[PDB]
């Protein structure tokens, strides 16, 4: 059964609600982004309208085989009417195609669903500017002050510099990057660019990247592994056993692997600054875990909410324990008292 924090009161709409069968009274199903916990249940057999971004629609058609007659892509930053209700899609700064959804209800109430997002000051100059919001459905993944991590730019600078130094010292080194979904493409694209290489990958992963409207993509990626010195592998293979195995398949073209494992937050962010990060090493293989987040830090989330000044907040993550729920509610009250709304 579909939970309350996925229902839009006063409409026939749901958000990211595909795993509950036919939802009673739902005439339009919105999808914020193409991550499996959110799309769970969608397939070629789905026969109701799905509203989403153009990139999300390309992935629905090509990867899940959803029939084209049921895919309703909407442009960003544009007032659209769906089933008699004005809606707007905004960039979420999450993975490719990810959106936040603004709903202008018939009764005059205004609701923002963030989906998954990494809050940024640039969102203060979207169509949200000077817009009253009555209800905010908030991605609270990292809603506690312990959750700190660097900017995406700082993490990419570290990765580029690390890879360039390694391959300049040893021209026979291979660089490997782990992946398990869409998102975090900048990690492998930035490394390949500094090295003058295309990124090599499986046919399945190539198909996924061909759906993302990335400019000049044919110049950047390939299924010919042997022409490339930056390879993508599934995240589960980025360990000493899996990398040793991969090194054998390249036919003595390479004599060293440098691998990156993009993670979210980890506890080492408490103690170790990104510049000070060191790898796990065994012989000619080194593995770097790098904290490349596509969710708001605590500080980023607090800034966004204090600027927006919503009347009510409904968390959508960490809602399953009394302790977690209470912790988030205490921070929302602090933020409101500090800012005066
Ligand atoms: C929102 C609100 C509360 C939680 C629970 N965690 C908070 C942070 C804790 N922590 C301590 C040291 C490193 C993390 C672990 C419990 C999650 C999300
Ligand atoms: Ni996500």
From Swiss-Prot:
UniProt organism field: Homo sapiens
Protein name: DNA cross-link repair 1A protein
Organism placement in taxonomy: Eukaryota, Metazoa, Chordata, Craniata, Vertebrata
Location in or out of the cell: Nucleus
Homology family: Belongs to the DNA repair metallo-beta-lactamase (DRMBL) family.
Role: May be required for DNA interstrand cross-link repair. Also required for checkpoint mediated cell cycle arrest in early prophase in response to mitotic spindle poisons. Possesses beta-lactamase activity, catalyzing the hydrolysis of penicillin G and nitrocefin. Exhibits no activity towards other beta-lactam antibiotic classes including cephalosporins (cefotaxime) and carbapenems (imipenem).
Name of the gene encoding the protein in the UniProt record: DCLRE1A
Tissue: Expressed in brain, heart, kidney, liver, pancreas, placenta and skeletal muscle.
Residues of the full protein shown: 700 to 1040 of 1040
Induction notes from the record: During mitosis. The mRNA encoding this protein contains an internal ribosome entry site (IRES) in its 5'-UTR. This 5'-UTR generally suppresses translation while specifically promoting expression during mitosis, when cap-dependent translation may be impaired.
Subunit composition and interactions: Binds constitutively to TP53BP1. Binds CDC27, which is itself a component of the anaphase promoting complex (APC). Binds PIAS1.
